[PDB]
């Protein structure tokens, strides 16, 4: 069970660093904006908040899956 | 919902979901038809193979590419080939979800009006939009001043663009990519000995160049080191048990980029291409494209491109002037990489071209925004 | 003084002197060595004949053949055969006068630079040089634009000249010729009974298929024509006092050079490679060597090609554009008469590879002018 488990936990974890990197180059992209639409200014906002809840979450399954080991 | 990227390209498919880092499926686009009798009992009939099981079969099979030059020749086979994409790579109904493809610059009308009305009548997707390739490339670099330089296979394309206004009279197209480099490579290695003929011997050969190839920093001083001493030799290893032993020609097929009279045309390097471009546009905008070249593509992953390129440009260009070569790793996907950048973007949530729309409008609707 | 003109071939030799009509000497290139014991005494143990009396006592002979494909494999038997040549066939020593030798296109580089090595050091002639095979096809013929499809034995090949200015990119060059010809002649006659396995027998089929042979205006009415009559019938004799009757083999033979899928390969027909080498070159020049095309080699002599070939061509060209086979008589010599004419002419006189050219510039002089 515990394999298995540690498993599961690395596929999170690497489903979680491929959001990762897609967030950070939407927003790579919208910064550099000068007059964006009023839909992106949220949008932007928007992405910003899901990168920072998608960091927490990495650094919790990391913490979990060393723990278990 | 989820809006799938498909980059049909011209020697690989790219297909993938919006919202990601990587295409979720990738292939190349042949399709095989069998070539010999056929003697078992039981085995189970198949016209023809398609996507990597005919890669994987190429002994006993006729592969065949269904495009060419961007410009598709075959329905019947790219009809194929989207449908494995769709139904059998990602097991994903196209019905639910849009769909965006990308298509090469100054290609043919019709070809737009033929994808639609096959990516309409017949798979029923909801929406579709298109895309021009070179252009998705600066989502990805991250900037919106530049002149991109995608270099697929088949065919390469340079649009240079200032503050998300794209320049439609500098843009540039060349029939150059490398589908021709592998033919050279087996023209040229037929000096040694090792001839290759048959499609899957071709295949070979472009494993051949994949693996040991480089572009040479200057081209004179690399023959003659090449010539006078015995170090600029490599060894490969054929399915069959049998060793190559490649010399010069590691560097001379790359080579025909920057001079393309050694397969008998007659236009001049990527590198003039490319300052022509840039001499195209207005005088007030040339430092800035100067500033901020871009590279794309998969055959742009020859070591030392970056660094050839940019001393060509510099000894081209005039003084006073910075020249930079952003090259980035995994330019391969770069294209693809903007598509899905473009499809999460809100704004562009309003652009699709829905089925009612191109109902009522007929063919025309998609060339409006070309 | 009179320059040598020897045409070393794949199936055939052709010595002779320039300012001649015709080669003074021509016997195959083959090598025989003894395979029985020898139990009299007083014959004198020869170690292998060479030449035609190798051919004239095949029966306890196995012969080989030292060039296969243009390529040549065995050395030491192509310098017997040259030395049986230059002192019992022709009679002549090579110091005094100089020698010119033809190779076929697209040959390793390799072979060019051994040759020469083995026509200096060893026979020491004062000067030495080599042409293209095809190219001296157009002296003889007598024009200057055109587009030759020289097909001897061993291979074939095709070179398009336009006003004397041999475009290098649209040359092919294809392995079908006429020993595949006599292995499918051998493979088919097994059909019937008539079983030919040993070298010899494979002399005697290639004596078969030199004499009843011929090529079909129309392939599918032919075979109807066979089957439903019995007027396609021939009667031949062997060496044995047997007969053997020849029906439908007489135009499946000749048929593999239009559909090369009968003997497991994948290359289109000679037909299509015309087709295509005519297509690669550029827009302007098409008219012209589609009006004139040429034929040479010993393997375009079936009766009938010269009518099948327009009408294949004809097919596939587009119209209002005129088609003709430029198929003189005596073709089979043709490659040689060239280069008589050209040893004759006093221009070429200037460009031989003096002695002491090689020896100071080394074995790399041959290939400036490749
Ligand atoms: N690492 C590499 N080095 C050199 N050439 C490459 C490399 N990867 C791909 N190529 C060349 O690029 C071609 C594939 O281009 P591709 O990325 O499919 O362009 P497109 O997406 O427009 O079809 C191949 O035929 C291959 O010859
Ligand atoms: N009259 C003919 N009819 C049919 N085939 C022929 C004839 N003469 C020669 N051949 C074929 O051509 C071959 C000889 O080719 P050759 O003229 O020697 O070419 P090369 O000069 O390049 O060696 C022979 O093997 C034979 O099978
Ligand atoms: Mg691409
Ligand atoms: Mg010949």
């Given at each position: 069970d515990l394999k298995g488990q540690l498993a599961k936990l690395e596929l999170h974890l690497n489903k979680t660093n491929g959001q990762i990197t897609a967030t950070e180059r939407t927003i790579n992209y919208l910064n550099k904006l000068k007059n964006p639409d009023p839909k992106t200014k949220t949008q932007l906002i928007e992405l910003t908040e899901k990168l920072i809840k998608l960091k927490q979450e990495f650094e919790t399954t990391i913490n979990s899956q060393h723990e278990i080991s | 919902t989820t809006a799938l990227v498909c980059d049909n390209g011209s020697g690989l498919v790219k297909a993938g979901f919006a919202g990601d880092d990587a295409p979720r499926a990738v292939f190349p686009s042949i399709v095989g038809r069998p070539r010999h009798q056929g003697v078992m009992v039981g085995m189970g009939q198949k016209d023809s193979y398609v996507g990597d099981e005919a890669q994987s079969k190429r002994g006993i099979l006729t592969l065949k590419y269904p495009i060419e030059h961007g410009i598709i020749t075959n329905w019947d086979d790219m009809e194929k080939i989207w449908h494995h994409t769709f139904?059998?790579?990602?097991?994903?109904?196209?019905?639910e979800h849009p769909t965006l493809l990308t298509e090469a610059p100054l290609n043919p009308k019709a070809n737009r009006e033929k994808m639609t009305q096959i990516m309409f009548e017949t798979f029923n997707v909801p929406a579709m939009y298109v895309a021009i390739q070179a252009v998705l490339s600066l989502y990805a670099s991250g900037r919106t001043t530049g002149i991109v330089l995608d270099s697929g296979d088949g065919v390469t394309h340079n649009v240079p663009i200032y503050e998300g206004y794209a320049l439609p009279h500098a843009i540039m197209r060349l029939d150059l990519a490398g589908r021709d480099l592998t033919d050279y490579l087996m023209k040229i290695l037929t000096e040694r000995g090792y001839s290759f003929v048959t499609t899957a011997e071709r295949e070979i050969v472009r494993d051949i160049k994949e693996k040991l190839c480089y572009v040479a920093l200057d081209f004179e001083n690399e023959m003659a080191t090449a010539a006078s001493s015995s170090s600029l030799e490599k060894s490969y290893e054929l399915p069959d048990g049998q060793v190559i032993t490649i010399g010069n020609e590691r560097f001379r097929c790359p080579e025909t980029l920057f001079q393309p009279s050694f397969i008998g045309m007659e236009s001049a390097g990527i590198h003039e291409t490319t300052y022509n471009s840039i001499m195209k546009c207005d005088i007030d905008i040339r430092k800035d494209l100067y500033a901020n070249n871009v590279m794309s593509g998969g055959t742009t992953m020859y070591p030392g491109i970056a660094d050839r390129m940019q001393k060509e440009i510099t000894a081209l260009a005039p003084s006073t002037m910075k020249i930079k070569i952003i090259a980035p790793p995994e330019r391969k996907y770069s294209v693809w990489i903007g598509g899905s950048i473009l499809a999460s973007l809100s704004t562009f949530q309003q652009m699709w071209i829905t089925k009612q729309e191109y109902d009522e409008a007929g063919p025309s609707i998609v060339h409006r925004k070309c």
């Open positions: - | 139904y059998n790579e990602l097991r994903v109904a196209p019905e």
